[model samples]
Target: GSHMEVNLRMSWWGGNGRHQVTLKALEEFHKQHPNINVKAEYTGWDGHLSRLTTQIAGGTEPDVMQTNWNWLPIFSKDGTGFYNLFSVKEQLDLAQFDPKELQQTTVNGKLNGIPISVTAMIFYFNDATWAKAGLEYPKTWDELLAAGKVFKEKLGDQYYPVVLCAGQTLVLIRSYMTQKYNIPTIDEANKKFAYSPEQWVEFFTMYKTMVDNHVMPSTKYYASFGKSNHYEMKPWINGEWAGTYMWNSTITKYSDNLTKPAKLVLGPYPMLPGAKDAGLFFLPAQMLSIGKSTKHPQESAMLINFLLNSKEGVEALGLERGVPLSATAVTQLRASGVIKDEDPSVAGLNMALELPHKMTTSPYFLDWQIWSLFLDAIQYIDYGQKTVQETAEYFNKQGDRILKRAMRGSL
Candidate 1:
């Protein structure tokens, strides 16, 4: 098969950084294996699922594709579609990858993909802003609340302590609250959504309090930016915002664009001190998988291996798709000075490597639908359309129903 003529189509979602790095890596791969011709497709993160669904259902999906771990069960359930990469496990090595990360990539005990990167939710703060407010980094929920008060009293409308992006902010809130309550969002083994109405009430109430206190950005401010663009690039880079709930991917971009002298520091998710680092939300950053319908699985696998495991591949790509999963690749890039150790862009990966935690975000989470519903509930709460209690109840009811459906289908 390696000696045969092959043409492989691969697709991923990313900005210019991801596209540039991946293209360079693919170019190198093509130079090495002139027999294999690879066609690359890329797009923004928005609406990627629907687009991929259309292509897959029409049997015109790319031969190789980048997919998220949470989508594995939805795409692979019932065993009628999507190839199980584990069927060819002997041909690929998995020993170096984290077991927890690999477990999340499986559907019904079949390995569907490889985790290319892992991510956690953390608070990225501007040190200069906090210093001006005469506040220190919050170590606990209480400290965070206190710091917010200081910022509010001192900065008022001049600076927002936490810039909340409506869409992903909900996930950050969930990570914080879930860790606080020690509640698992979904039970993978029993295939159940696990949380009570009261627990959700607590979650939403806390969020509402933050909103009311002006610790977070108002819905009006977020809505002004056209829903998507409002939260990104404008607020944080514009310097009116002080801190934000963001992933490591934004760290480098923010650092590069800042006109003022500022340092992006990572803090554990706001939690009670002495509680386990519940602040870390472990999700598969992204993955490359072979299309079940592809005629050349080997070629697809080679591309995946090159993109994920090769140092040269990653150096060309940087941390665009979160961070590279290959420790060796990371070490090489650091040694070559392509990436700095103190760079906040790689902090999430560093934290994951140093202090591994229980993997969250399984197939049973109703991840896609529930994330949308959760975001809507946040909007409603922010816009005064519903009380926190009302929004919480709505989410709890809908979330339970969605999880039940996913469970029934899987069971």
Candidate 2:
């Protein structure tokens, strides 16, 4: 009997470049496997979590999903939310990925997904802009903070040494806190934050200091530019927003948006005096998971294998999805001269790997609720509605509630 056609729906959220390349790769996959039809359900980053959440709850999610590493605690609290990829190993080439990388996506012994790439928060500076301010990239936290004054004085008030969004601010401060106190942010076993009231006060104080010294804009001031992608803003494009505390995987988007001839360069990772761990927010950039409800798990795995490991598929996808973690994909991309050593994204990854990152991050750290609460708390200080002390108290109270709720229930 002739083989029957199988239809699989795949969903992902990203910018247009990702969407375009992924679609092209999917076309190649479809052409190779004529019996399988993959319908792409792609979208922008905003609202993707809520949209996917509704779909998952309704048991109507796409057969293949672009999942976040942090989402495992929410979607598979017991490692049962998604199909175990190990079961369909015949179709998916699990051996192409590192054992440790696979372990990162494995929940309670179930291989819930295939990690796409690893990412860490690394500093990036617009070289032309930095040079305009008569300074090199900062090698120490103090130098970075002080550069704010230099930029303001030399490049005019519109320029800044760096621009970090709320989440980036959280990661940077977490690095500082971890370096100074040698503590992780969350106490997963206790279902509470590890930071004390005074520590939380110190956290908010750091942010206030940055804003006060012009190291970065306040939430209030950034909002004045109107809400949009920060890269799309005139300040960033025009080279006035000179640096970023950004991910190794996504640095290209920031660099690509910079004015031509003004290249974004990876800066030295700021280390506090005698710091042990880098406290880098290192994690899988993304994952491809098979929905538990999918009827064709094998077919879904085949699609994943193609996009991640096949020669043509790797060529088509390039570095759009960050540096490929799949061994086969890396070999293919390297042979094709796509993943170069000098590329900022690749260099950033190498630099991150060299830094000490022994501390493990809890999944709850990036939870949407907690992230929003942190941002909301920052607003109070930004608007002069609350002092740093008040904001710290507010965040500690709200953040603990959010973390407790998440740990107690399925997010």
Candidate 3:
């Protein structure tokens, strides 16, 4: 009549609702299994990667670690980063997940992690804010530009047509490249940068025009938020910043973060007429992993199974993390009717699925510091510090070095 106590550590980054709800579920998990003790290390998204990388390097990551699809290449190039989930396939209910999502996490023929959600960028609007400007939600890039004039004339300088972070501006750039020219941000084999020098100039010129025209706020103001989420800023909550190119999963948190009780609506992906391709980046949003340092691989699998496949765990987590990537859990959630028919993200996701995904970026294709430097190049032109041709040349040269270090295979 004796069971050894199993002490486990789990870490993840999430918003306020995600933390409160996750902790509540953990409490219930402990109640159900008294001997398994889980220490929670949840936090906001700020500096999460830095902290997680340090833990992985030191071989002291939490037993159950939250991971992204891209993290695998950076942390575990040899695919030894996390305990292979396939080894515990019998222990974990692998059937509950889709083969498509599973393929995204697989490296070197081993499943490195169990994915929790499939995420893509979805556009959301503050319907209340737009209505005040006597404008409907924008359907095309041109329409959005047009609305900027109206919002500025009617609403004043405090507001803009859209509120997007620097990274988001990068997304719009990808969208433009894909839509106008059918060129990807980065090419296959993870090498051979996609945009031509002229393409870079054209891309920069268009977005810089957006910044100049008040279609969105300046990089200078968005800079104040730093790496912190712009949604955390008061302008976003108060409807001074009107809309977002947000991840599909985090729609709830952003909607809830608003203090002014604005009506949230999912808008179209802002396409141009006769576009070559849809500009959505659909891939694994989040994943769960058991650290290689753990003595509790089986226990970790059990927790993941519970959290991902069980009705109790899924309901507790809800769509907070995202629509469940687990089929069984999603069925339970659908039966529970937690996701409403009118949910903004739901409609946005519908359109996203209909679009043809042009490409997927490998983790090696993006180094955060490198990516940030590229973002800075966009700003150099946007802030008028660098000319369009100067910035394009800088990216063509400086950007080449960043990829050189990562070294995509022969192609």
Candidate 4:
């Protein structure tokens, strides 16, 4: 295993920033393991999904790859589709990783991947926007609604406390469902929904109120900006759209893109009053999975281990991935003053750690068709194209079928 040419191919998707650091890190890996040579296949997000999917289908997946947790089910339907990490666990220094996270990565009772960062939908606030509007960060859902009213009144109709796309609206509603009702969004195994037809009505009514109160813009208003991120919009740069319910790992990028360089802060996820549990959809942002087809599983594991657990690895990578899932990496990152108290990812991780999860994850969670169904339901209700009751009935009827479709015979 030492001092020889062992060609290993690794593939990942990222912008130029990630690409630069990642390639440097890979170079370090090659230097560290003289025998292992990594030929990286890196590119932007565009068509990357399809490219990888096709590679997996062709039984030609890369030996070492940066993988999304959601892709496991789609790629490894039978659960044997990826290299079994348990096969290399003793070889891995997993003392730094939480036991629960390793368990989360298991597929069909097999450890298929290792997490790099834990992710949750955490709130990031534009402190500048809030102060300009004479408001402090909202502590609860009720206060957030109140803030919406204040922004609309003081900053004019164009400004709002929040501005979620239609897609994010579904996530917000799901988080609401989890906190308020203390149930999984979908009972995949039971082939049933977490909410009733009537509760769905209440949920849509909540969505309507969000739009009506200016907490978020409606689909009609959002589409007017044309094809691009809301962050790039002039209103956002100008400090009109103030708060974001976004992934904790991504807050830094969002902060970087802002114009006028506002003071952004992480805010607590608003818990509903007397809630049974936290509704946060906590997950790993991404995982490193070795290919089952790989000729060198042991070497792949070493590569992933170095990328995740090594002091050199985490330091080189930084919080570019997310708050470290590795306990060792986190301790060092904190103690070394790399992740400060004011950093949104740091504060967000702190807030996320205090909450109890309502559910882990389900195959139904990542299905775009299923996600689109939720979005369509809200749109139907909002557009008056279908009554809440009618939309609920439609979703109710499709519920079992959708769940069945996502995991037809696998489960």
RMSD of every candidate to native, in Å, equals 4.1, 3.8, 4.9, 3.4
Please list all clashing residue pairs in model 4, or write none if there are none: none
TM-score (C-alpha, index-matched) for candidate 2? 0.82
Q: Across residues 56-124, which tens digit of lDDT does each residue of candidate 4 receive?
A: 989888998988888877787667978998888765777778766776688888877888888777788
lDDT of each: 0.70, 0.87, 0.78, 0.77
lDDT by residue for model 2 over 108-207, one digit each (tens)? 8999999888988989999999888889888888898899899888888888988888888898999988888888789977899999999999999999
Give the C-alpha lDDT of model 3.
0.78
Question: How much RMSD separates candidate 1 from the native structure?
Answer: 4.1
Candidate with the greatest TM-score versus the true structure: 4
Winner by lDDT: 2
Tens digit of lDDT per residue, candidate 1, span 120-236?
556778777877888777766667667667777887765767676654566666666656666676665655556677878888887877766667666666554334443356656
Worst 10 residues of 4 by lDDT: 219-228
Give, for candidate 3, the lowest lDDT window spanning 10 residues.
Answer: 358-367
Candidate 1 residue 99 Cα shift, in angstroms, is: 1.4
Question: Which candidate, 3 or 4, has the higher lDDT?
Answer: 3
